[PDB]
Amino acid sequence: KYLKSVLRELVTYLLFLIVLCILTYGMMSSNVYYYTRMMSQLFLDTPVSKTEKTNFKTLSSMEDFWKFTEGSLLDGLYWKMQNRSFIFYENLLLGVPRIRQLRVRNGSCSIPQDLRDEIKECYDVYSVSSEDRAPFGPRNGTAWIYTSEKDLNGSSHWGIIATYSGAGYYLDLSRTREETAAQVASLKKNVWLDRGTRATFIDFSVYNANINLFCVVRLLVEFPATGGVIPSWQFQPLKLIRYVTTFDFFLAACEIIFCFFIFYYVVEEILEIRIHKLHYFRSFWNCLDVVIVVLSVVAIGINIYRTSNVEVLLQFLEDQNTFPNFEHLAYWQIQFNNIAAVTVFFVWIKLFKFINFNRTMSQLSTTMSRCAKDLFGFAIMFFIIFLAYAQLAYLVFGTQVDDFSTFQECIFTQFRIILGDINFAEIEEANRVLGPIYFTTFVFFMFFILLNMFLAIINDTYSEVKSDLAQQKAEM
């Protein structure tokens, strides 16, 4: 046999690949790019005021933030129509933007008594157990009163320094600039960004009715306890009103067919595991199917969890003078994309099983497979030295370089050096004794010696495989 059985097993895979490709082409269009590009350039690439050149992307002080919040921010939220506020005369600013603050309390840490004459207070780094909850300043509104995480429908964020909660002191802004500017001025006069503040969030969203794509915008600013400002941004093109055009029904039908295909595969895998050979995991061709089906079922579960959860849109459509809460939907969309992008990768990778249709491809596959059993040991022995260099660099230079400021950053820096991108022109300033020594040793031992065993093993394996397959003709 081996032919009349594989032909069905091949066409069933080809149809699966076609459906997956249709889905991938469907979700990713070419209109999201320019949408997000203009949306980002409107807020990030514009100076706070015409008399300086410090944009939100390069904030450096607590004072610059106030210049930003009344400035390039208000100028890019409210556009006078030739009341509603269309950003680019196409994008609709639905709802109102909301600002929020996360801060810690006075006396959150301890100082020694021998120098407790000059140090009058300390503000410890942000922690859920050290977060202030008392009302400060003038106790008028929601901007000076703590609010629990469940009363804001919020969640965690996982910023750059730490993972911030969903609570804090929040404030909703108006619809016209005339009142939003007054509110911001009121916040700035009665000092609101004190020394105790640790994080600030700004959130809003737009519609852009021409195409059907919501865009949710979040801006984070972090204040480390050691001083400084760290900005971050996130623009997400969500889509929530899918069924309008025929292509949408086409995509839904392809999704249904995809679910049917994955159900078929899981059934034929359970049948094979139970009604046939047990513990068939020494193949790498069946350990790939389980990964694909698990990733697919996780993606389907996430889609069912998220798509069926859209009542927040209905609540916003009831009254459209309140802040819409679309933060969870963007997070789940990001998670769904991160899963689909890996699923399609493995689906494409699986195609290698189907290419043995002549001598050359078969022998290349044999060489590639036989060369994996022994490359594994050298890969481990090489990665051990790689991590040794990584930890050495992290311990030595990981305090002044900022390219080695984190372990994974050290790994990426080493890989970039391997590609030939990073030069040590700053390492001497970082260190003059152990800098050039480390650089020379790394670029000599792991680029002239260690990196050639990979070539040697492959070269020898291919040579012996070809010689064996040629000798396989002296017997026949």
């Binding site: 120098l115 000059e118 140090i119 020394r195 001083g227």
Partner: protein, 49 residues
Amino acid sequence: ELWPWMAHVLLPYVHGNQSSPELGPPRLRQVRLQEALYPDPPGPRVHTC
């Protein structure tokens, strides 16, 4: 310009309302040599000092 630099950016950094508690006054230890130098011919530097 060292004097304007210190008078403009450093002194406001050391003092102030709260302004980054210091734990210690500064110092200006300084060496002289006693072997009076002469300016090099025009040009920043030829090889080294």
